[PDB]
Design a protein around this ligand. Sequence first.
Ligand SMILES: CCc1cccc(CC)c1NC(=O)c1nn(C)c2c1CCc1cnc(Nc3ccc(C(=O)NC4CCN(C)CC4)cc3OC(F)(F)F)nc1-2
Length: 277
Amino acid sequence: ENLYFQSMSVKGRIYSILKQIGSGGSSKVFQVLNEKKQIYAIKYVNLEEADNQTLDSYRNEIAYLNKLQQHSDKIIRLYDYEITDQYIYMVMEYGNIDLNSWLKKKKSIDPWERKSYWKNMLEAVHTIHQHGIVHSDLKPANFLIVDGMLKLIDFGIANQMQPDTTSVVKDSQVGTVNYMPPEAIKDMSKISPKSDVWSLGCILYYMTYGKTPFQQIINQISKLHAIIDPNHEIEFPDIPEKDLQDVLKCCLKRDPKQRISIPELLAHPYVQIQTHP
Ligand SMILES: CCc1cccc(CC)c1NC(=O)c1nn(C)c2c1CCc1cnc(Nc3ccc(C(=O)NC4CCN(C)CC4)cc3OC(F)(F)F)nc1-2
């Protein structure tokens, strides 16, 4: 729903608010225009009931996002931010849609498009791994489409919060365990870069086969048991792209030791071999 007279200031710069395009418990996202009618998304986070630990995780993610955006164009831009004791405003790159919503409204995805997105994702995640950050909770919703290019929105660093404001409402894929790796389920560090490869593999599996590998299991304890059980054979239906079949089998090995790495994935023929005549 659009906001028709609202506006906000960030570091002495005024922004017209067109509409709200998202919400967590303590947070909101707004489609906004600056003084020169350039479009942005502003993330607002209320800090009024956040403890020092939570606060410091927000501070950490902001520092890292400000640094890492210079290292890759597959991370979302953070143009400015304002940070007080009460709130954070972040002025960020705008996208017309996130990958989750895009995939919901696409049955048949173009093979070229899928490969292009796969590359974008790999480059983003590779970048955070290179600075010691394992996201540890990658879903399609963490990726924003900006003129055909996927941008990673967050680094999984910040501590999530709950609507004790209430009037409670939430979304399809926030709780989801469909992208979760076996070692995460055992775990309750032992969090390695390989955790992210499983999650990325699950996204690619969605793009290839039209669902995540354990999506069929409604019963959430049966699902978690299926993810861990070596005898539970994951399906990989035959398709023209034999390199894509290989990538998925390699990402979804349950043993993280035996599971493929991001540098390996980047040199894989799926990413590298020119299919075009
Ligand atoms: C809530 C804050 C938060 C906390 C923790 C972690 C995270 C990251 C996941 C975040 N959340 C975030 O950090 C976050 N959440 N959103 C939604 C955005 C961000 C970052 C910047 C950003 C920039 N541009 C956009 N634009 C849009 C992104 C997605 C949609 C969308 O999916 N719409 C659907 C289209 C199809 N129909 C059928 C259903 C709706 C529409 C959008 O803009 C438009 F609305 F203007 F069009 N969004 C975002």
